[PDB]
Amino acid sequence: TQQPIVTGTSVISMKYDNGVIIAADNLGSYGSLLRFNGVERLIPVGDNTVVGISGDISDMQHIERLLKDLVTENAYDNPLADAEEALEPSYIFEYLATVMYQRRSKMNPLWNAIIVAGVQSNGDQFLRYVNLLGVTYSSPTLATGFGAHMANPLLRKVVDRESDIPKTTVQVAEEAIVNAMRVLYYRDARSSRNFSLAIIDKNTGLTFKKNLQVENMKWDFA
Amino acid sequence: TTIVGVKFNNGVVIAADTRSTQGPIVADKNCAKLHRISPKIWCAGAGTAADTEAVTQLIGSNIELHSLYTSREPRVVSALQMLKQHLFKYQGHIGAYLIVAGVDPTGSHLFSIHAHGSTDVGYYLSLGSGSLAAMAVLESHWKQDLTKEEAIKLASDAIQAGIWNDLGSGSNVDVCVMEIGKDAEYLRNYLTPNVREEKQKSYKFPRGTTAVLKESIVNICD
Amino acid sequence: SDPSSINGGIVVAMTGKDCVAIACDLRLGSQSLGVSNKFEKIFHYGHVFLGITGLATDVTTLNEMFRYKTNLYKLKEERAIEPETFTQLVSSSLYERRFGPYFVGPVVAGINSKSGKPFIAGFDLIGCIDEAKDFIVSGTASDQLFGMCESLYEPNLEPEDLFETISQALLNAADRDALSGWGAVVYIIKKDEVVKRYLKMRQD
Amino acid sequence: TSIMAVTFKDGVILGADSRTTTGAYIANRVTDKLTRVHDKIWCCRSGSAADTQAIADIVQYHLELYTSQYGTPSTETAASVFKELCYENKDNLTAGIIVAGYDDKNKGEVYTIPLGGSVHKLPYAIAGSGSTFIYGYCDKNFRENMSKEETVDFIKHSLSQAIKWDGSSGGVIRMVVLTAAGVERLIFYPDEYEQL
Amino acid sequence: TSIMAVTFKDGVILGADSRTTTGAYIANRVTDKLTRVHDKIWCCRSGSAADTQAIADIVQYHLELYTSQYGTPSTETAASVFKELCYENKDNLTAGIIVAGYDDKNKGEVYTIPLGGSVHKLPYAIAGSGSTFIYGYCDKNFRENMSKEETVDFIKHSLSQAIKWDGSSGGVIRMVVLTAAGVERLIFYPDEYEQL
Amino acid sequence: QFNPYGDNGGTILGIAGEDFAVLAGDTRNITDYSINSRYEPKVFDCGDNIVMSANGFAADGDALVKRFKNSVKWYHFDHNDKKLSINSAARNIQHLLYGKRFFPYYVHTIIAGLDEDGKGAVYSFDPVGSYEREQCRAGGAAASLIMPFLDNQVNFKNQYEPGTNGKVKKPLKYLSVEEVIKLVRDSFTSATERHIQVGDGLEILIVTKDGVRKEFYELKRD
Amino acid sequence: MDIILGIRVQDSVILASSKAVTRGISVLKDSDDKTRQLSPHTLMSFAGEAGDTVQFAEYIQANIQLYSIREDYELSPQAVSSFVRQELAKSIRSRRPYQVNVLIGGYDKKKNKPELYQIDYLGTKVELPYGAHGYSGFYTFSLLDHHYRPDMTTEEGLDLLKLCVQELEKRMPMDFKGVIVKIVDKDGIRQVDDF
Amino acid sequence: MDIILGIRVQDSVILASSKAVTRGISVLKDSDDKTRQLSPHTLMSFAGEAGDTVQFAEYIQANIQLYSIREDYELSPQAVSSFVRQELAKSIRSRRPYQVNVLIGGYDKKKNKPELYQIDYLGTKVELPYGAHGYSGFYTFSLLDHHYRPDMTTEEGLDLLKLCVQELEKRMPMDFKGVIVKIVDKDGIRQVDDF
Amino acid sequence: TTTLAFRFQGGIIVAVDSRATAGNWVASQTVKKVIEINPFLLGTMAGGAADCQFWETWLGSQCRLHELREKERISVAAASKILSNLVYQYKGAGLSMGTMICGYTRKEGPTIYYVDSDGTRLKGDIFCVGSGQTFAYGVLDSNYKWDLSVEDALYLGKRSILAAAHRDAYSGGSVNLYHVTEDGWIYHGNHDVGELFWKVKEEEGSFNNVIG
Amino acid sequence: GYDRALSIFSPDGHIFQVEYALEAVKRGTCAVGVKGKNCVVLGCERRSTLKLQDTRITPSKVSKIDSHVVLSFSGLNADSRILIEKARVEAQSHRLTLEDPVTVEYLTRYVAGVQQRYTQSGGVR
Ligand SMILES: [Mg+2]
Ligand SMILES: [Mg+2]
Ligand SMILES: [Mg+2]
Ligand SMILES: [Mg+2]
């Protein structure tokens, strides 16, 4: 039994024609106090997976160490560690999902909501969610916390079902994600203006964007 | 419930969904959440259904008597003042959450009221369980100097976000347009995007299927 | 100690072609103990029919109260109250007890004598009006009734066909509820004739 | 909320953020927490929104009736009416109000009224959840008899920090200037104050 | 408590008040909250006094055993040991610790470890009940690559304000300077810092 | 205090014919008033012509299905590739569930297939391992809506032969796969109308001696 | 208090009511008559909370007796039962409700028919061929479902009642010290002394 | 469970124990023997929590019978009582204690004296001329204080016991369905069939 | 549930209802509450359904192991005590069971044991167990004699369940009958209350409280 | 714990420790059992190199396991006490769970099982 202390808010994501996009702000809240501002909540695993984490930051840092150790362990006695036997997004997710459900079953959870975004070896987009309860689900768009309530509706206007994915470009997809982040800054009392964004494409690979800001805001009607 | 209100050029428009629930069960698939306080002042209500209907009727009644007493068309701020003082007096026990809008000799107005008796002003507002889904759309697409047709589109789009993404909201979209110098235009079932598909089978029973013990003619006359 | 499920019971109403139907079960119990199998839950004031589910003492009290009020109405108005008007009276009366309510689930049914239009309506315990073209449900097997009605119902049923639909809706819903059943009554209502039928159902 | 009021050479200035909260959801990002109870007597509001409105409306009514009989009320008188409501209804209220007004005899005055309903006349006052983070800054930077431009900068910088650390504060910084010249409304947007 | 640690040009300085509390009673007015875990790695302590002592003692033991085998530990290593204890025993601990040390390769470093047991490397850190009142002041006044005298003044002024507003903070201001030159202990009494 | 359980909504339905059996379930996944996924399958082919669904708390549901699938695998390893009969599967699932009697799997479980005489079979379980073979069973959030309809249309309850004075019951007979799918589709469209946690899509798994076939149908998305 | 029963037969209503009054671990009395005559052809038995029972019974008795004197007329059993129900229906939403359950057995002289009404403390009225309050019903209702016929005589009703008391004396946990039996018919109210 | 009594007279110990087993609002049995023979000249009656009572009684019985076989000798009543006390004294600080109260009536063949021991679930042992567990004692102790003499015969003891049962049947709230009476003396244990 | 079993001149009658409930929700009407342990042993189920189902089939496995090891069918006493000793180990854990172990052996004759989840084990001639036990007792006790015929005893058991099925809201569905003799148990059919009630009402003239 | 496998097979397929235990039995005083039409009689030898014995208190050769079963033996006296004790405990345990005393076959089968267990358990002879 826990209570979360230092926390991170929404993580948002979606699929597009060639890959997936994921984003999360750089804030570590301490209750109502906006305590830490240099917190990276997107953690890449290899060159084909990004894990976005919300909730307790001490538990997030623990999960970082686990993923770091997983890469090390996979390389052991593995000549194809950077080829056919490299860590897939599906492998990384299932591992985390196992851990999350085991910890909830021992009544000592990792107080987090997690989204694993990546591209598989065959080119297929991977996007799946898991949280402190061990609950898992997948969707063309996925978001945690406030993102679930405010980002998902906006992202679903772009990709409402499976057939909308081939019709959605990386330009259109990123535009929707960046817009959603602005809306969250307007309306979430534990969001920050600064955020990170990651694109995992089947052709261009992993692009990690740091120190992004929310811009073009409307206030003058005040 | 999902309700919104949006200001435009020469007036104000409000909208709402048409789903009524008791727990997870849908009681009414086409209930009317748009209420009339006076001919050109209309109310959208979420929360405890009986409270929103009763409080809108009581103030509507007193507004009519006031209009007759003063030989003047009723103002939105009068309805706002009466509603908020009534709700405050009951310390939130009357669970009425309202978006009040209308036109009067002073101009066009848009307010919200919360159950404890707090009021606020805005060019765009949203209340109810689907307010976050609606507000996400409003924050994304709203601008200064909207036309009538643009405001109706924005309002109904905000309600649709609630219909699709919020489980508390569903079915149809009701709209009411209050323009300065014109009659208020109530648009019942302005949109109907949730029509029930044809059933696979008719469940009309052969006559005599039900076993009967007694028959008797009932006297309704004097 | 949940007032709405001590005694048990159900009521359902439906519309058809130039007609309406309202039905109810006959059980009255005290939690697990079945006490009475003659406790009807449908009453009428002139041509307007009212069904009431919930705490039985309040069912009785409200019937007596609305008989009281509709009698004074008729004396002063010199005409029988209509379903639309009576629906409003029920709503007013329930909301008057907002912070000390009658634990009931009433259902109005009838045909307007002037227009000829079939009318049904439902309420929560504090007076919220639920109007419907098709059907209204109430009681401890309301979930079951919602499921039965939504699947079985079709519009513009003839009185004889409507009887079969509403009866099957009630019976099969009641059999999936421990606190409902023990007999049933169905009212078929036309413009100027009303037929009352008691249904044969399982007595467990 | 983060709110404050500061006396200076020519009178007094009130300041406030624009955030309204119901949990972590921002119910309104463009709120007006600076409220008129008389021509040149204004209040800053913190706590319950329903409570602070009901109070401010009653005060405005009392001072309007005072004016009809006895002419312009003093700022002290306005604060006393706020106190009377806050003190006598302390069990049912959550209201932290700062009262600020301009007389010609008394110049600028600031009265703060915390939860209990006590009154405290001060050179300047800070209140709301975000005020905790600027006690250090405000104490070190406040001077008596500042100019209009200096006082505006003091409030702008102060509320900027309160907004930066308090999640319950944000949006725009509204200000109201009370002097012999009249009443002036100021607004400052994120793009300006965030990068101070 | 009010505590802080600040990196600067020549290294890092730790700072703390001297108040120990059991309720409103001051159990000790001359407390030493700055503790040595290694020659040039020190910690600042906040929260439970029993918890923070048990932790610091275990860390000191771990780093003494580290030194016997692998030589001088990095400041990062010391912070990791603190984290490991705070994170794994989060249910039973109330400890807010700031770790600060001087390497010759890495110069001055500051790591803060809040209640949950997370680690945060920062240019400077503030913690304890009194830190809330100086977030605004410290953010506005901190600069990177300050001198020794500037950093001492920054800490002295900061903790002075924290002490002024926080009832749980007071007494003397202790400081510990970590540079290549060595370890220097500083003390500052009320009569000096109160009238800043 | 940490609550190890959640409610992921949705509803499931199993019907058995003479030489076939169906196991249907909606594809919507929810928490509180939000939709997590519009397509998250919860009816699975477990091998040996056994289909299974464990509806309720999805984390427990996935865990159980995962353990049973694994049980089938080891049954082959330990007993010379012998086919696991539906009755044996049912008993095995009881022990899986009851093994966590004092910290239960929060699910209503239904399995379907053919018995050892080739006839259609449906088994249903309570959360702690109680089981029973039936012709008919609905499960999950809308079970209370659908089940009485099934009693009436599958088992012909409360239906008497016309003109027989309520003395002769309507005779029981097996339904064709065409007739069964009609009832499934109508059951789910009705449940979608009146239950907020039910909608989006319907996935039916049909089991005959030839194998396991799938059919998908759209449901209302409000 | 505890056990009160009622059976309506062809020409009479029979009420049986337990004699025990228990407080704590002591039976304070074993001859208590848990009934009041409301009018010459109407009898009410009662059970429930200590004090409340008698206070309520006597209050109703006073009111019906007042009515009888005022109008020089006896109210019908149906009328008396409705009056009693309304009093309990008022009571349940009072500051301190009467926690009393009653059976009303009467003979309607205008209809020449016996009538038995069961009313609980909430004000829940039902007319019945046989009735019971408290845990008694859990045994007696099923027993009477089997053995009761509508055309029985008073003597047949008493034997049917003996069968109920025997069952209760066998399976009930508490010693209720037997019952006082009273008959209501066309000739009024009388007590059976040897039961 | 509920009523267990014991009386020690000149030459014997007499135990009386109620026959009822009640669960909820149902008397499931009216012929239950709440006693176990531990050895030929030692008898233990018991009352308390359902299940615990019999489980504890039979466990003690098994242990004493084991001792008897091992040593080819009968333990004294004093020795058996001390063994039982210690088991209950252990039990009270266990994870789930035995909630059982017992009376041990025995005849010491070496001393040629009857002995009665009262032991509660905490492990509180006392030797007494007469004993009782539960609410029974609140009536029987004062009664026996008055009528008991130390030099009474077995027949006088049975009449004294009848006086206790009569009082309990008059003033106790629950129907305990009479008692099974057993006598322990120099010739062993025997049951009185007509009580 | 309502279950009963009584001993008489011609052996043992065992009768049970078939309803399952989750609160006021009627979960099933077709439940098997009698478990056939061996050709001479029966077990009745009441209370927690998984508890009853799991542990009584487990009991059957223990009885089978007894006759393999001892080359002799287990006694009713020993079979009932395995179950009672098992549930006693779980006392306090929250098991919910009201069971009756009924059967015949040479040494015992016809025997019935009541076993419940708080560890109570009682030999007896008549028991009724479940939420509707009192309704069954009322009819059974008032018509019981030792000298009942096999035909009359079967009916009384059937009629007693019917009585409880009618009055108890948490009992119903159908009646399952069993007769246990020196030659073993004999099944006497499933009897739906839907038809059985009206058949009994008409033929017996009882249930006059109901609208005919 | 002491784990050594003391009872093991030899090349010719004999377990010498079990066979040497039989030699200890051969050394013990003679015991005989004869069963009639309605009884069983157990006879036992007692060696007479021991005078000045106290026969009141000296352990008897025939032991009661229950009131209806007896056990005599030949071999190591100290070893027999351990078997007798275990048998006596099992006798009471059987009465407790089965509600019936042991059969002679069952009691024998138990005692024999104990003896067998000590032939393929580590650390025991
Ligand atoms: Mg039913
Ligand atoms: Mg902020
Ligand atoms: Mg739906
Ligand atoms: Mg029933």
Q: Which of C141, C140, C104 is nearest to C123 (CA)?
A: C104
Identify all chain D residues contacting E134, using CB atoms and an 8 Å cutoff: 136-137
CB H46 within 8 A of CB H102: yes
Cα–Cα distance, G121 to H1 (Å, whole number):
34
The residue with tokens 């939403």 is G93
Are the Cβ atoms of B215 and C195 closer than 8 angstroms? yes
What token pair was written down for D193? 């104050």
- Number of domains chain E is built from: 1
CA distance A155 to I197: 61
Q: Which chain H residue has the Cα nearest residue I129?
A: H28
CATH code of C118's domain: 3.60.20.10
Max alpha carbon distance in chain J (Å)?
50
Burial I45-68 (b: 16+ CB within 10 A, else e): bbbbbbbbbbbbeebbeebeebee
The CA distances from residue H73 to C105, E80, H57, J70, J77, in Å, are: 77, 71, 21, 16, 22
User: In chain I, what is the greatest distance between 2 CA atoms, to the nearest angstrom?
Assistant: 59
Q: Position C182: which residue type? A: W
Cβ <8 Å between D54 and B120: no
Cα–Cα distances (Å) from C70 to C23, C48, C62, C65, C117, in that order, read 22, 10, 12, 9, 21
Ligand nearest to the CA of I161: 4
Rounded Cα distance between H33 and H181, Å, is: 10
Contacts (Cβ under 8 Å, ≥6 apart) of I118: H49, H50, H51, I91
Q: What whole-number distance in Å separates Cα of residue F115 and Cα of residue F93? A: 16
Question: Taking a C-beta distance cutoff of 8 angstroms, is the pair J50, J59 a contact?
Answer: no
Amino acid at G95: R
Q: Which of residues 136-155 of H touch G (CB under 8 A)?
A: 138
Q: What phi, psi does F22 have (nearest 5°)?
A: -120, 145
How far is the C-alpha of F108 from the C-alpha of F90, rounded, in Å?
13
J91-112 exposure pattern, b = at least 16 Cβ within 10 A, e = fewer: bbebbbebeeebeeebbeebbe
The answer to whether D110 and D7 have CB atoms below 8 angstroms apart is yes
Q: How far is E189 from chain A (nearest CA, A)?
A: 30
Using the 8-state DSSP alphabet, how is residue C31 labeled?
T
Q: Could you say which architecture CATH assigns to the domain H1-195?
A: 4-Layer Sandwich (3.60)
- Region B1-222: CATH code: 3.60.20.10
**CATH code matching the domain that covers A1-222, chosen among 3.10.310.30, 3.60.21.10, 3.60.20.10, 3.90.209.20:** 3.60.20.10
CA A51/CA A11 separation, integer angstroms: 10
Take residue E45 and report the two structure tokens written for it. Answer: 């302590």
Query: Quick one: residue I98, left, alpha or beta (phi over 0 = left, psi -120 to 50 = alpha)?
Result: beta
Q: Work out the burial of residue F196: count CB atoms within 10 Å of its CB; fewer than 13 is exposed, 13-18 middle, 19 or more buried.
A: buried
Closest CA to I144 of I127, I132, I122: I127
Q: Is residue C39 within 8 Å of I209, Cβ to Cβ?
A: no
> CB–CB of B120 and D20 under 8 A?
yes
C contact chains, 3+ CB pairs < 8 A? B, F, G, I
How many angstroms separate the CA atoms of D4 and D141, rounded?
14
| DSSP bridge partners of H15 | H6, H182
CATH number of the domain to which D74 belongs? 3.60.20.10
Gap from C35 CA to chain I (nearest CA, Å): 8
> What is the distance between the alpha carbons of residues A88 and A49, in angstroms, rounded to a whole number?
7
> What's the one-letter identity of residue G69?
I
Query: Contact at 8 Å (CB) between D181 and D168?
Result: no
Sequence-distant (≥ 6) Cβ neighbours of residue J74 within 8 angstroms: J25, J28, J29, J30, J31
Where are the strands (E) in chain H, listed by range?
4-8, 13-18, 21-23, 26-29, 35-39, 42-48, 100-108, 113-119, 125-127, 130-133, 179-185, 188-192
Residue G106 parent element (H or E): strand G100-108
Report which bound ligand comes closest to the CA of I171: 4
- Separation between Cα atoms, residue B127 and residue H94, nearest integer Å: 58
List domains and CATH numbers for chain I. 1-212 (3.60.20.10)
- Three-class DSSP category at C184: strand
Q: Which residues between 152 and 181 in chain C have a beta carbon less than 8 angstroms from any beta carbon of chain F?
A: 152, 168, 171-173, 175-176
Residue I153 carries which side chain, given as an amino acid letter? A
Closest CA to F24 of F172, F198, F175, F155: F198
Give how far the C-alpha of residue C173 lies from the chain's centroid of Cα atoms, to the nearest Å. Answer: 15
Give residues with Cβ within 8 angstroms of F194, minimum separation 6: B25, B26, C146, C147, C150, F142, F145
Give the catalytic positions of B in this structure: 1
Strands (E), D25-172: 25-28, 34-38, 41-47, 95-102, 108-113, 120-122, 124-127
User: How many contiguous H segments (helices) and E segments (strands) does chain E have?
Assistant: 5, 12
Residue I79 counted as an annotated binding residue = no
Structure tokens at C6: 């001590």
Q: Residue G131's closest CA among C184, I201, C178, C34? A: C34
**Interface H:J, Cβ pairs < 8 A:** 22
Q: How many domains does chain C have?
A: 1
Q: Any CB–CB contact under 8 A between I121 and chain J? A: no
How is residue D74 written in tokens?
């003093």
Classify residue A195 by its DSSP letter. Answer: E
* Determination technique for this entry: X-ray
Coil, strand or helix at A18: coil
| Facing residue for C147 by CB, picked from F148, F157, F166 | F148
H113 strand-pairing partners: H108
User: What is the spatial distance between Cα B90 and Cα B81, in angstroms, rounded to a whole number?
Assistant: 15
Bridge partners of residue G7, in order along the sequence: G14, G130
Kindly report the number of other CB atoms within 10 A of residue F34's CB atom. Answer: 17
- The amino acid that residue D124 corresponds to is Y
Judge whether A164 and A158 are in contact, CB under 8 Å. Answer: yes
Q: Looking at chain D, which subunits does it touch, using at least 3 CB pairs closer than 8 Å as the criterion? A: A, B, E
Amino acid in position D93 = L
Q: Do B203 and F160 touch (CB under 8 A)?
A: no
Of D145, D175, D144, the closest CA to residue D158 belongs to: D175
Query: Which secondary-structure segment (H or E) carries A66?
Result: helix A57-75
Q: Give me the DSSP letters along B103-166.
A: EETTEEEEEEE-TTS-EEE-SEEEESTTHHHHHHHHHHH--SS--HHHHHHHHHHHHHHHHHHB
Instruction: Give the nearest chain F residue to B162 (CA atoms).
Output: F222
Q: How many whole angstroms separate alpha carbon D62 and alpha carbon D49?
A: 20
Nearest 5 degrees, angle CA A120-CA A121-CA A126? 5
Query: Which pair of structure tokens corresponds to residue F222?
Result: 């409000």
- Cβ contact G57:G65 at 8 Å: no
* Closest CB to D132 among E132, E140, E164: E132
Secondary structure class of F30 (helix, strand, coil): strand
**DSSP label at E54?**
H
Resolution of the experimental model, in Å, one decimal: 2.6
What are A206's strand-pairing partners?
A200
Within its chain, how far is the Cα of J99 from the centroid?
25
In chain A, which residues are last before a break of more than 2.5 Å from C to the next N?
none
End-to-end CA distance of chain H: 19
Q: List Cβ neighbours of J68 (8 Å cut-off, separation of 6 or more).
A: J101
Give every strand in the sheet of C184-189, ordered side by side. B212-218, C194-199, C184-189, C19-25, C10-16, C135-139
Name the burial class of residue G24, with classes exposed (0-12), middle (13-18) and buried (19+) by CB atoms within 10 angstroms of its CB: exposed
> Could you tell me if I105 and I63 are in contact, meaning their C-beta atoms sit under 8 angstroms apart?
no
Domain range for residue D163?
A: 1-196
- What is the number of alpha carbons within 13 Å of residue C172 lying toward its C-beta? 30
Cα G126 from Cα G119, distance rounded (Å): 7
- Give the integer Cα–Cα distance in Å for E185 and G145: 96
Q: Report how far Cα J53 is from the mean position of its chain's Cα atoms.
A: 24
Question: Which residues does F contribute to its contact with B (CB < 8 Å)?
Answer: 30, 33-35, 141, 153, 158-163, 165-166, 170, 181-183, 185-186, 189, 193-197, 220-222
User: Residue A217: which of D18, D165, D190 has the nearest Cβ?
Assistant: D190
| Domain residue ranges in chain A | 1-222
Q: Which amino acid is at F191?
A: A
Q: Please state the φ and ψ torsions of residue A193, each to the nearest 5 degrees.
A: -70, -35
CA distance linking residue A142 with residue F212, whole number of Å: 31
Ordered domains of chain F (ranges, CATH): 1-222 (3.60.20.10)
DSSP collapsed to 3 states, J51-107: CCCCCCCCCCCCEECCCCCEECCCCCHHHHHHHHHHHHHHHHHHHHHHCCCCCHHHH
Place of tokens 């406040």: D142
Contacts of C172 in chain F (CB under 8 A): 148-149, 151-152, 157-158
Residue B213: closest CA among chain I residues belongs to which residue? I212
CA proximity to I81, closest of I66, I96, I68: I66
CA dihedral C157, C160, C164, C165 (to 10 degrees): 10
